[PDB]
């Protein structure tokens, strides 16, 4: 779902660019200003990424913990299944 959303965003840009190009050709306003602002707002992320890296590490650790918990419950389930099988055999 996230991917589809991202694609939609990029799609707008692509189409937007095409429109701009055509617009310029014809010319040869507000939208332009808006675009400029967006531009000013990955490059910058570079320095910001430094921090993101630290936070990514934290959220990786959390995921690992969750995985462990899941494994625990999984083991219990397996044990239960085994017990059931044994009971059936006895019957």
């Amino acid at each position: 779902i996230r991917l589809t959303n991202q694609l939609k965003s990029l799609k707008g840009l692509q189409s937007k660019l095409k429109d701009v190009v055509e617009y310029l050709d014809k010319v040869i306003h507000t939208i332009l200003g808006k675009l400029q602002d967006v531009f000013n707002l990955n490059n910058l992320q570079k320095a910001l990424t430094v921090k993101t890296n630290d936070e990514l590490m934290v959220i990786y650790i959390s995921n690992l913990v969750r995985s462990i918990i899941a494994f625990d419950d999984l083991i219990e389930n397996k044990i239960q299944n085994k017990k059931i099988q044994e009971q059936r055999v006895k019957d």
Partner: peptide, 24 residues
Amino acid sequence: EDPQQVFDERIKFANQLHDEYLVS
């Protein structure tokens, strides 16, 4: 980058444990 690698490693271990559980 180093930290990220460590995190990824942990995630791998978690997955491995889950696999063994599922296979079991």
